[PDB]
PDB file of C-alpha atoms in Angstrom:
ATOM      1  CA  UNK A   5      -4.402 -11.846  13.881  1.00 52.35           C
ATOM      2  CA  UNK A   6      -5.334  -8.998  11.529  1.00 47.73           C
ATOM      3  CA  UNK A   7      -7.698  -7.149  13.888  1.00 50.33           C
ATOM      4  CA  UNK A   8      -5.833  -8.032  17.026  1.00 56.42           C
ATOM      5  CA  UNK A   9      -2.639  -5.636  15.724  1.00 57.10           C
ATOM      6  CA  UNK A  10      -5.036  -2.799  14.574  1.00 56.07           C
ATOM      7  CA  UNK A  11      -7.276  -2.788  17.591  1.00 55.25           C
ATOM      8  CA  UNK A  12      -3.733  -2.595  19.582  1.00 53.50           C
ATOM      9  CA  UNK A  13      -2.803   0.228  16.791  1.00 55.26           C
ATOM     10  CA  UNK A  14      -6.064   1.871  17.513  1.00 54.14           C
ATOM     11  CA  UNK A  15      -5.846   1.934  21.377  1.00 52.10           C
TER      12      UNK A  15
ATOM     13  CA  UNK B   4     -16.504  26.471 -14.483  1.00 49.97           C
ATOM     14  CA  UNK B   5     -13.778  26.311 -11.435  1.00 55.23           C
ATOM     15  CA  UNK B   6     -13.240  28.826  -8.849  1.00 59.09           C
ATOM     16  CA  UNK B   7     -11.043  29.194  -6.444  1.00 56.32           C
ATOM     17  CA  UNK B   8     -13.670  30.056  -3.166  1.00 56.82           C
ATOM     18  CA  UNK B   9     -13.708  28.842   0.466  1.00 56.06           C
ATOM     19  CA  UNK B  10     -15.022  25.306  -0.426  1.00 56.72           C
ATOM     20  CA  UNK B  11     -12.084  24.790  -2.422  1.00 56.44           C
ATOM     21  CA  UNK B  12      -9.880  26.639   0.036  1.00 58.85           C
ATOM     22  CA  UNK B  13     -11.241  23.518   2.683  1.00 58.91           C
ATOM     23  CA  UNK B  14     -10.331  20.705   0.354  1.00 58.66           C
ATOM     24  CA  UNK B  15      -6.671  22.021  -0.809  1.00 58.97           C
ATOM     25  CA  UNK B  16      -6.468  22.120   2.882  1.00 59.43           C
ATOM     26  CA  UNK B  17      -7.556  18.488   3.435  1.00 60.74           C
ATOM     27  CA  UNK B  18      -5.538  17.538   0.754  1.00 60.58           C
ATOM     28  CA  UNK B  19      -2.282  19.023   2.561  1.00 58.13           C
ATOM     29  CA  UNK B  20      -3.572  17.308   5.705  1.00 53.33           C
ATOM     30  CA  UNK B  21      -3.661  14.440   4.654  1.00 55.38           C
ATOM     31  CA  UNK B  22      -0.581  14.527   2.357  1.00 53.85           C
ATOM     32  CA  UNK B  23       1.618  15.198   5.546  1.00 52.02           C
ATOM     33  CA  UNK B  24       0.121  12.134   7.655  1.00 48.19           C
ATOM     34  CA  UNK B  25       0.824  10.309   4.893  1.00 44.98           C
ATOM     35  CA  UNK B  26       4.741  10.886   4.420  1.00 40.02           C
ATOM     36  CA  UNK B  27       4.923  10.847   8.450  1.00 42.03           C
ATOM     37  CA  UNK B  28       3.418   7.545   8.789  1.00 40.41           C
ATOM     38  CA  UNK B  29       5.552   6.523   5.220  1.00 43.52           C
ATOM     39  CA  UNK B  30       8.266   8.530   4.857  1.00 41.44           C
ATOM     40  CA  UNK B  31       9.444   6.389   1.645  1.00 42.42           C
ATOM     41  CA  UNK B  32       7.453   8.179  -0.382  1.00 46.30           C
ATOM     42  CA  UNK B  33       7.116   7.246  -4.274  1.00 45.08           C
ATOM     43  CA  UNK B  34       9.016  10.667  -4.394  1.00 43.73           C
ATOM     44  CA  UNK B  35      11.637   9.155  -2.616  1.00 42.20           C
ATOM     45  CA  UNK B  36      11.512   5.523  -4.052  1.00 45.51           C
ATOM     46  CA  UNK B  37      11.288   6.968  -7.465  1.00 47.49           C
ATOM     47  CA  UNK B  38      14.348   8.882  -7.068  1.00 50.24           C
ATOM     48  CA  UNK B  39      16.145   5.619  -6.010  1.00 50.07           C
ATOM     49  CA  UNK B  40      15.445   3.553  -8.876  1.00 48.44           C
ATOM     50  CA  UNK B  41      16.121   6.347 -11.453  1.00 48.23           C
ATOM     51  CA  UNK B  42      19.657   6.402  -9.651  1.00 48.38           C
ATOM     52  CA  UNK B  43      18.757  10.223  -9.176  1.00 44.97           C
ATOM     53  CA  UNK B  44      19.742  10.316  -5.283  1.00 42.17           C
ATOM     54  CA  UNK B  45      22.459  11.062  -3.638  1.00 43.07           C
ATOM     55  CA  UNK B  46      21.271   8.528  -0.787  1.00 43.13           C
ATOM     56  CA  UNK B  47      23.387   4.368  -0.364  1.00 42.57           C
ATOM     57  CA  UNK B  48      22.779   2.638  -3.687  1.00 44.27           C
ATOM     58  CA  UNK B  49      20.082  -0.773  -2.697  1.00 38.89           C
ATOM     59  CA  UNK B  50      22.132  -4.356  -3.412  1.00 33.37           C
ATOM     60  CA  UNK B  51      20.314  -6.057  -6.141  1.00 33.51           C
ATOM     61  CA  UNK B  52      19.102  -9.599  -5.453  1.00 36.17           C
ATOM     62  CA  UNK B  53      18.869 -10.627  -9.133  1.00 33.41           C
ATOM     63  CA  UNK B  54      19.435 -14.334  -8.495  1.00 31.91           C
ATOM     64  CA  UNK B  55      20.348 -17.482  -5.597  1.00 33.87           C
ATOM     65  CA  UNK B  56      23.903 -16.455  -4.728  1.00 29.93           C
ATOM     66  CA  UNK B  57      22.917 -12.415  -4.310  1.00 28.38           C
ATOM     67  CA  UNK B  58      20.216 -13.335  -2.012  1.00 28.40           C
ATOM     68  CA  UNK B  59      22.513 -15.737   0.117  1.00 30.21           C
ATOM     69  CA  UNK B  60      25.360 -12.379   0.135  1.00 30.28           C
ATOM     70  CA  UNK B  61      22.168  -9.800   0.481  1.00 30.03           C
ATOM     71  CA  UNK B  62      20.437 -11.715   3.885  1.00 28.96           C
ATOM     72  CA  UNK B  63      24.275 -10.463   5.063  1.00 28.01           C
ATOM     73  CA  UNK B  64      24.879  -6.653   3.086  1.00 28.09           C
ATOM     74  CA  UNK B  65      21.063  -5.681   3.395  1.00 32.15           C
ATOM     75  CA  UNK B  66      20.375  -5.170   7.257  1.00 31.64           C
ATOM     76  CA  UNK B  67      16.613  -5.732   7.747  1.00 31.44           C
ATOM     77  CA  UNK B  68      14.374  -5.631  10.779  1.00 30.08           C
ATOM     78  CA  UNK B  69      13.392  -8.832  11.187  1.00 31.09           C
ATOM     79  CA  UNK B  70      15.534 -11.392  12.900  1.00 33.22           C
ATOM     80  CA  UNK B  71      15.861 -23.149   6.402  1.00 38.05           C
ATOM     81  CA  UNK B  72      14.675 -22.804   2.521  1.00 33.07           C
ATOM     82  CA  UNK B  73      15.134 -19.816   0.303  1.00 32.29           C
ATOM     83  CA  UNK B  74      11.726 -18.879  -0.874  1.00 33.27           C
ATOM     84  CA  UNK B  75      10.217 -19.703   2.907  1.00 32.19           C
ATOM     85  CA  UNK B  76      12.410 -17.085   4.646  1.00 30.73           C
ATOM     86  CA  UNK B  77      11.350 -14.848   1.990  1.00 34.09           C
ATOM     87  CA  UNK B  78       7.573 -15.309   2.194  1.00 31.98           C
ATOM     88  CA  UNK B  79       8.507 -14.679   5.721  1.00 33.38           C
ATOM     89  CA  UNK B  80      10.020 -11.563   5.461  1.00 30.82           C
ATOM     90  CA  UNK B  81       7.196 -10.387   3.594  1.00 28.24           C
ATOM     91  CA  UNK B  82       4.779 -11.271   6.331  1.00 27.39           C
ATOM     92  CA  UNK B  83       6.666  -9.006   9.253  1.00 28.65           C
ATOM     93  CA  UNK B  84       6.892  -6.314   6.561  1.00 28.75           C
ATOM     94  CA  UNK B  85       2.908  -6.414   6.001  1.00 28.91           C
ATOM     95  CA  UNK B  86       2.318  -6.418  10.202  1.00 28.16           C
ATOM     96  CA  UNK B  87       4.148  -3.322  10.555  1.00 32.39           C
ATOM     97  CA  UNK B  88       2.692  -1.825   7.380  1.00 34.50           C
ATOM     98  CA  UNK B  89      -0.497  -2.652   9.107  1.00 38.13           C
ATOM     99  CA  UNK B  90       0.060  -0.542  12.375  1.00 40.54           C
ATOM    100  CA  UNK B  91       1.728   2.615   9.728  1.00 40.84           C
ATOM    101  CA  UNK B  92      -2.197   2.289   7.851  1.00 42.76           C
ATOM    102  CA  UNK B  93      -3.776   2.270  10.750  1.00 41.41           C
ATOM    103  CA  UNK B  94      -1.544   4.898  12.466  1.00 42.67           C
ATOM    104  CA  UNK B  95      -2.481   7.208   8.809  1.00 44.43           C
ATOM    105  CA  UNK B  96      -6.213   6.107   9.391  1.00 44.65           C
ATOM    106  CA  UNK B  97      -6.358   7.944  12.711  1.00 42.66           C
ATOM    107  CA  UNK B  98      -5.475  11.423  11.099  1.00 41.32           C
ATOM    108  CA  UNK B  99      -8.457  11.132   8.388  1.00 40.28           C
ATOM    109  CA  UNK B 100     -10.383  14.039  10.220  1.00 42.12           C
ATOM    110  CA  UNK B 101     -14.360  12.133  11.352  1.00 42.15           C
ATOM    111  CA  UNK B 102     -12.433   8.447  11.521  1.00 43.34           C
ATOM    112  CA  UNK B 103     -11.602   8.273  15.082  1.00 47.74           C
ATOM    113  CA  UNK B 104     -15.089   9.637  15.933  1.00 48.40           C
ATOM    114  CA  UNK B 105     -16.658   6.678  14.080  1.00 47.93           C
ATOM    115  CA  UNK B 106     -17.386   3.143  16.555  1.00 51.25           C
ATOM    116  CA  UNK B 107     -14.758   1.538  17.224  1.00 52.82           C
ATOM    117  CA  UNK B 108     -15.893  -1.359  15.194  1.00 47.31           C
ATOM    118  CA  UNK B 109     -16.612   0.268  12.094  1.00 43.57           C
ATOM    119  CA  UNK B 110     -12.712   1.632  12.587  1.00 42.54           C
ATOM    120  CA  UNK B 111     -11.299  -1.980  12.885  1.00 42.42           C
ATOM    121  CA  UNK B 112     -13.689  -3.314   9.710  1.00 46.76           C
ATOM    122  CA  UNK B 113     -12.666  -0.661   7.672  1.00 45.14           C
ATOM    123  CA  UNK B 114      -8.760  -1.495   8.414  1.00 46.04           C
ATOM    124  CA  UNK B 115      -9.393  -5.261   8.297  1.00 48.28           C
ATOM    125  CA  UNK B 116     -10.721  -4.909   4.637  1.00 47.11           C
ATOM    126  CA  UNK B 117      -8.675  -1.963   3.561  1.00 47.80           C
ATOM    127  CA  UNK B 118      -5.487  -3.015   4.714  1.00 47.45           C
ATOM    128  CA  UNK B 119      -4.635  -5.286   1.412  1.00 42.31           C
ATOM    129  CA  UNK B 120      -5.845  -2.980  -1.058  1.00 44.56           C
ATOM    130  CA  UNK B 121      -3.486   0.015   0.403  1.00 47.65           C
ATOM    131  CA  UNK B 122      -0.678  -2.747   0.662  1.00 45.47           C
ATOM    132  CA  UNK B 123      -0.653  -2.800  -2.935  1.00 43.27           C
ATOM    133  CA  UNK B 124      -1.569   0.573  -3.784  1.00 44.72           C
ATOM    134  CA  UNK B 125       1.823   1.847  -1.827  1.00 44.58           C
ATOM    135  CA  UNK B 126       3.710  -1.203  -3.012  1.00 46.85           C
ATOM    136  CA  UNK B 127       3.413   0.124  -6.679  1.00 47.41           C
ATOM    137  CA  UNK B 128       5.976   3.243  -5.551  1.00 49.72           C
ATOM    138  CA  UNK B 129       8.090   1.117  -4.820  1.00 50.81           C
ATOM    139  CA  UNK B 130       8.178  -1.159  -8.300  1.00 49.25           C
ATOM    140  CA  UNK B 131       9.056  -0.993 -11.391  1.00 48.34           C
ATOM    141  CA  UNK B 132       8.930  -3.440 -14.228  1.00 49.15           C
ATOM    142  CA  UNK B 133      12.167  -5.094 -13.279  1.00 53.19           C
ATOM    143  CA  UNK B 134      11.487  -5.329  -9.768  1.00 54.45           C
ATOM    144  CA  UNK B 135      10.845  -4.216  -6.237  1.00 55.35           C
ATOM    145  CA  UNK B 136      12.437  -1.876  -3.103  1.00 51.05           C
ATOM    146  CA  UNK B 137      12.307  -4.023   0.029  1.00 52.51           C
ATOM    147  CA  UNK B 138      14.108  -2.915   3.614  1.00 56.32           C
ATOM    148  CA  UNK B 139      12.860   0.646   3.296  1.00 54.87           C
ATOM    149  CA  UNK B 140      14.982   1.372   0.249  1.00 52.68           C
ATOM    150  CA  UNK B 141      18.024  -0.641   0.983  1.00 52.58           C
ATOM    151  CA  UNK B 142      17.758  -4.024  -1.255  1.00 56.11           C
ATOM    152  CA  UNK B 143      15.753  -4.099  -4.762  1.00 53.58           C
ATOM    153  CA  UNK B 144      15.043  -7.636  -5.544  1.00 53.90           C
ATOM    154  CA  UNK B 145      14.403  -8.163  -9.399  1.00 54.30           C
ATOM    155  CA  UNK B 146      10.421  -9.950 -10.402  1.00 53.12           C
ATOM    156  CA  UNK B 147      12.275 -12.301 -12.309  1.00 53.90           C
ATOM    157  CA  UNK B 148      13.910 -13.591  -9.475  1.00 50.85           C
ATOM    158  CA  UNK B 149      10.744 -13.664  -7.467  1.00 46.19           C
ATOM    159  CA  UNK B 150       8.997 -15.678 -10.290  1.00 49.25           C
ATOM    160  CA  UNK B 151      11.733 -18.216  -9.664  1.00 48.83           C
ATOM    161  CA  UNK B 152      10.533 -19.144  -6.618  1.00 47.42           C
ATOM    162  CA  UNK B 153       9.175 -23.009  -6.432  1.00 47.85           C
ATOM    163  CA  UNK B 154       5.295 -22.943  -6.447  1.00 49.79           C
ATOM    164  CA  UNK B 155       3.592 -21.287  -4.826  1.00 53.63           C
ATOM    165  CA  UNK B 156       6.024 -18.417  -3.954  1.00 51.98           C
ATOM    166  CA  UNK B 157       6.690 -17.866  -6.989  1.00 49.69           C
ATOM    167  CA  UNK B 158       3.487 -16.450  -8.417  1.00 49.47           C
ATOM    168  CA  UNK B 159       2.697 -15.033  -5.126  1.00 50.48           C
ATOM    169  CA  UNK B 160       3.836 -10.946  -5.913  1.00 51.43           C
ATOM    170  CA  UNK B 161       3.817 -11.322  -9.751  1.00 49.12           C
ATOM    171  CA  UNK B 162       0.066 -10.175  -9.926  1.00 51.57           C
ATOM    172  CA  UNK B 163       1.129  -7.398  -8.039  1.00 53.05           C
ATOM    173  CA  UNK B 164       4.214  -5.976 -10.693  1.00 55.45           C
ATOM    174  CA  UNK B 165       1.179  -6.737 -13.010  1.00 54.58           C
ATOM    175  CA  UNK B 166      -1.085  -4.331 -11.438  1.00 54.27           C
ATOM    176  CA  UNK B 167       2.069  -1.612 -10.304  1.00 55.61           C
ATOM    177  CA  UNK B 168       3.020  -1.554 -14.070  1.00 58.02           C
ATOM    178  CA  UNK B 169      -0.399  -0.103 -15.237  1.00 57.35           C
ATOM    179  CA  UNK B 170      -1.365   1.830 -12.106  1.00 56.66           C
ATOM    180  CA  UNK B 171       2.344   3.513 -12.026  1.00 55.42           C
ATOM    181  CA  UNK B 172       1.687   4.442 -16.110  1.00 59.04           C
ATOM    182  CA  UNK B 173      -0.766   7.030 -14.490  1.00 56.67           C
ATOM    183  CA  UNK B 174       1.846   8.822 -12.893  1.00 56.14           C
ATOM    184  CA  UNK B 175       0.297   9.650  -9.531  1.00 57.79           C
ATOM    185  CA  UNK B 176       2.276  11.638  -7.057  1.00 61.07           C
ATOM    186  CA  UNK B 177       2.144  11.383  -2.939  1.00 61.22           C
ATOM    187  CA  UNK B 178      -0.332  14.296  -2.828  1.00 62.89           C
ATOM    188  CA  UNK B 179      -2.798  12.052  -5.235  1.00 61.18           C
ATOM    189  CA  UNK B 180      -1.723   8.743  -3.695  1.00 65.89           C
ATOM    190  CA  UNK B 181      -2.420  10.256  -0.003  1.00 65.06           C
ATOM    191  CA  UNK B 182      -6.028  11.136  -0.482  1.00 64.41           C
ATOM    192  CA  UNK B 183      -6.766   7.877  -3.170  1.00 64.08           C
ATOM    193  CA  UNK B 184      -6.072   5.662  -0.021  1.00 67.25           C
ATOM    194  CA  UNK B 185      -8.343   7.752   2.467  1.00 67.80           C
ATOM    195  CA  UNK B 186     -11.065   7.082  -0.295  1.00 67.06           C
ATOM    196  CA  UNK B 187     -10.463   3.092   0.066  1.00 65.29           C
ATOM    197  CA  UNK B 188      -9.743   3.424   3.824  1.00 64.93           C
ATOM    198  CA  UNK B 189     -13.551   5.474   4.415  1.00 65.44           C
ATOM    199  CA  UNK B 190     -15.153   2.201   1.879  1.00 66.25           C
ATOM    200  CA  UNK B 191     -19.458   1.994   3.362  1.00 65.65           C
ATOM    201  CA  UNK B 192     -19.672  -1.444   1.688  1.00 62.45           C
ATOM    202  CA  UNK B 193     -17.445  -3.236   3.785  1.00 65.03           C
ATOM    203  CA  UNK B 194     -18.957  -6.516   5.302  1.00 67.67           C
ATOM    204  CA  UNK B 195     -20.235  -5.980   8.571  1.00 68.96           C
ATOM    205  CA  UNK B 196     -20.722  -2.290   9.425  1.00 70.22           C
ATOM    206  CA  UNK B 197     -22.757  -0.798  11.690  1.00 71.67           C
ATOM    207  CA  UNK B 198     -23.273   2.906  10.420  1.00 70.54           C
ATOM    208  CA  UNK B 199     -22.681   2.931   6.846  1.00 69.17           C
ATOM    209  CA  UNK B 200     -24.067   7.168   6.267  1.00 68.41           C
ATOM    210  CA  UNK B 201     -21.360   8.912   8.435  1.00 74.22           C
ATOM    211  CA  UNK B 202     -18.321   6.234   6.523  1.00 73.81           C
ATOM    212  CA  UNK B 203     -20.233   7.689   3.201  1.00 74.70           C
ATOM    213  CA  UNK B 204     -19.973  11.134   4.271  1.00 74.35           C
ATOM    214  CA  UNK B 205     -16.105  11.027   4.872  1.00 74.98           C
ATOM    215  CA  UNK B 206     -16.077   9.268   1.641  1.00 73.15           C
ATOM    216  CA  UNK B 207     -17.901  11.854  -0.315  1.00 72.26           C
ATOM    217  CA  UNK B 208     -15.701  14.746   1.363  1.00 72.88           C
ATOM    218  CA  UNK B 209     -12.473  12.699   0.535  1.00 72.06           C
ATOM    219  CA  UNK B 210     -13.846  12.186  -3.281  1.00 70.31           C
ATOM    220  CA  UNK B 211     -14.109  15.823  -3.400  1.00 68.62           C
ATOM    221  CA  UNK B 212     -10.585  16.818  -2.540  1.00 67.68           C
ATOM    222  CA  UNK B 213      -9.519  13.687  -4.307  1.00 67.73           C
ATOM    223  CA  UNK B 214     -11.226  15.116  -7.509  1.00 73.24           C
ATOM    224  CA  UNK B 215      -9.801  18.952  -7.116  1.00 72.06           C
ATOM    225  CA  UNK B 216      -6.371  17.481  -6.542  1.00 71.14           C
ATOM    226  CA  UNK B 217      -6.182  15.370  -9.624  1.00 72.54           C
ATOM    227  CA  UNK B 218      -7.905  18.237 -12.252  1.00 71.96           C
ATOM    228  CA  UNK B 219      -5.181  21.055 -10.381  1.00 75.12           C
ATOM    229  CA  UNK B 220      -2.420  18.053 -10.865  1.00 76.86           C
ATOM    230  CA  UNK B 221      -2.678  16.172 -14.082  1.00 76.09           C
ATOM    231  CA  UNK B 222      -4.188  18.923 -16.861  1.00 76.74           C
ATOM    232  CA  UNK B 223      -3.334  16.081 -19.540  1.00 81.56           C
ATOM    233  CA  UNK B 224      -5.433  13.048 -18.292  1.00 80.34           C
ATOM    234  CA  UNK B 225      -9.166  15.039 -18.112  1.00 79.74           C
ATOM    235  CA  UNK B 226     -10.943  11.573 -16.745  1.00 78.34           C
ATOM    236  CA  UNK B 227      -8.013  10.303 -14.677  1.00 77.12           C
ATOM    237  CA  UNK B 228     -10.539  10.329 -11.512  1.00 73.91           C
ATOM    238  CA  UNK B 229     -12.525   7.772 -13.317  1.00 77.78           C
ATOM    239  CA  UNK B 230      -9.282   5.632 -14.140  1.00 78.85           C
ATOM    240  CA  UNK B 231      -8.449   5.428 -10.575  1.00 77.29           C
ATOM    241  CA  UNK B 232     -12.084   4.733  -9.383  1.00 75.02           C
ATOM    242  CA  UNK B 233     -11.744   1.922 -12.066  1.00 74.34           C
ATOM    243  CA  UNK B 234      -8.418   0.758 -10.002  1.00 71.71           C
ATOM    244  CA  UNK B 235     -10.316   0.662  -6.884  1.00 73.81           C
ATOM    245  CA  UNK B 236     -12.471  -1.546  -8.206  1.00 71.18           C
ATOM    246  CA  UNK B 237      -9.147  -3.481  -9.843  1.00 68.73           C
ATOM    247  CA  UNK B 238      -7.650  -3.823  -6.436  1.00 70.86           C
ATOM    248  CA  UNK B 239     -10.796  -5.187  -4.998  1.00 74.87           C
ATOM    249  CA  UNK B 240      -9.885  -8.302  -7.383  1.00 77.84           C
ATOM    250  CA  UNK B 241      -6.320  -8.176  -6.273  1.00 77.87           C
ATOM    251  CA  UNK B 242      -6.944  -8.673  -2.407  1.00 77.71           C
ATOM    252  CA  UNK B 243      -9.818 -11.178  -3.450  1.00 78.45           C
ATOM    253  CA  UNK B 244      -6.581 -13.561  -5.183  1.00 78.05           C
ATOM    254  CA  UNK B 245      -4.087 -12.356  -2.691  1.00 77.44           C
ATOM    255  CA  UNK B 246      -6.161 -14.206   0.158  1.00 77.02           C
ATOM    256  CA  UNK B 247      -6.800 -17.443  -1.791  1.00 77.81           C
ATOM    257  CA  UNK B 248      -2.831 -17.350  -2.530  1.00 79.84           C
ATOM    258  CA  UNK B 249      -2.829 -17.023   1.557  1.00 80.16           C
ATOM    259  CA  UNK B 250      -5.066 -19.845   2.032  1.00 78.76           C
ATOM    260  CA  UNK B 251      -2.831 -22.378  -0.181  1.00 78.96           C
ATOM    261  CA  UNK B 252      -0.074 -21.216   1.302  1.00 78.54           C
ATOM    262  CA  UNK B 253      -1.763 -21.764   5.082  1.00 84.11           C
ATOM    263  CA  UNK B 254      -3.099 -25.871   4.265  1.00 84.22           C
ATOM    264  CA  UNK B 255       0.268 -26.550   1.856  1.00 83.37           C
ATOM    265  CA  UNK B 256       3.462 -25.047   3.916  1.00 80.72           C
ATOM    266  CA  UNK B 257       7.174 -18.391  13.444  1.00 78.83           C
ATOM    267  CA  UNK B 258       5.192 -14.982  13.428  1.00 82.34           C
ATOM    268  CA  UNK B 259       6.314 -11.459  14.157  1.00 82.90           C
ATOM    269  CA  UNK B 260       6.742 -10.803  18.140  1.00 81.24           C
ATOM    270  CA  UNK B 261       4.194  -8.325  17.841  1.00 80.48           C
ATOM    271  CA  UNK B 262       1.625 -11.572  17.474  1.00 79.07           C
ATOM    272  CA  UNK B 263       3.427 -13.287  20.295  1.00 80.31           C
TER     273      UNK B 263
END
């Protein structure tokens, strides 16, 4: 679930 | 033979850059923290949890921003403190000037396997050898206490105090701390990236300021640039236990609403 939170942080 | 020209001029200024995203995205700043546990603030004392009954009155005292055993609910506080730590590295990523101009990708790898390693780095502001700030300065819960958590909570942080005790004996301020996790952030050997020279080149740049701030801040320690290349390497090790400890946990034992 690591890269789905940054991905949202990134966007 | 030092000089103070343009070049330097550039990385004092990427230095301040960076120090300000920094205590925006974490405004408990070891500066901060430090002043807490040395009782030298005029800011609300943190309730000690130094044992079973001053956890069971802290859960009340302490108001955290999360929402049936002891050492469970604790684990899981720890969890919904590392998501939104998570969205504050990435959120301090972004302002590294060439990382948002990188793919996409190579942003999210470098965040998936830097994440840990700055976890840990920050965490050490916050400790000291008797224990830890949690709830953004409210509560300090002792390392003793944590140890005597039933296995395998209770040797889950204690390599962490381990590796706060030495790294905080170097003495490292924000404005050090700042640009030391933009090095680990802009890391070219991360599994899986797609355009390794442009990562380097941040890197290089952020090495640079890195090793101007540390000879202008610490005229005492003459190789303390190697010592804390040496702890990036260290922490490497750290993250590499941390998710084995996370595996165990996973096959032997609710998520934040951010997940859900």
């Amino acid at each position: 679930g690591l890269e789905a939170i940054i991905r949202k942080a990134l966007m | 033979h030092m000089q103070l020209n343009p070049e330097s001029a550039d990385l004092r200024a990427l230095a301040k850059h960076l120090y300000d995203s920094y205590i925006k995205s974490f405004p408990l700043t070891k500066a901060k923290a430090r002043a807490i546990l040395t009782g030298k603030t005029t800011d609300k004392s943190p309730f000690v949890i130094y044992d079973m009954n001053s956890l069971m009155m802290g859960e009340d005292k302490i108001k955290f921003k999360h929402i049936k055993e002891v050492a469970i609910r604790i684990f899981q506080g720890c969890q919904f403190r590392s998501v939104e730590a998570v969205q504050e590295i990435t959120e301090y990523a972004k302002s590294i000037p060439g990382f948002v101009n990188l793919d996409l990708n190579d942003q999210v790898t470098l965040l998936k396997y830097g994440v840990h390693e700055i976890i840990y780095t920050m965490l050490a502001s916050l400790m000291n050898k008797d224990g830890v700030l949690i709830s953004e300065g409210q509560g300090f819960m002792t390392r003793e206490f944590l140890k005597s958590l039933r296995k395998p909570f209770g040797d889950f942080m204690e390599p962490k105090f381990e590796f706060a005790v030495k790294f905080n004996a170097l003495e490292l301020d924000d404005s050090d701390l700042a640009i030391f996790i933009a090095v680990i952030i802009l890391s070219g050997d991360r599994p899986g990236l797609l355009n390794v020279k442009p990562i380097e080149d941040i890197q290089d740049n952020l090495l640079q300021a890195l090793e101007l701030q540390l000879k202008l801040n610490h005229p005492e320690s003459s190789q303390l640039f190697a010592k804390l290349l040496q702890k990036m390497t260290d922490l490497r090790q750290i993250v590499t236990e941390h998710v084995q400890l996370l595996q165990v946990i996973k096959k032997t034992e609710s998520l934040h609403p951010l997940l859900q």
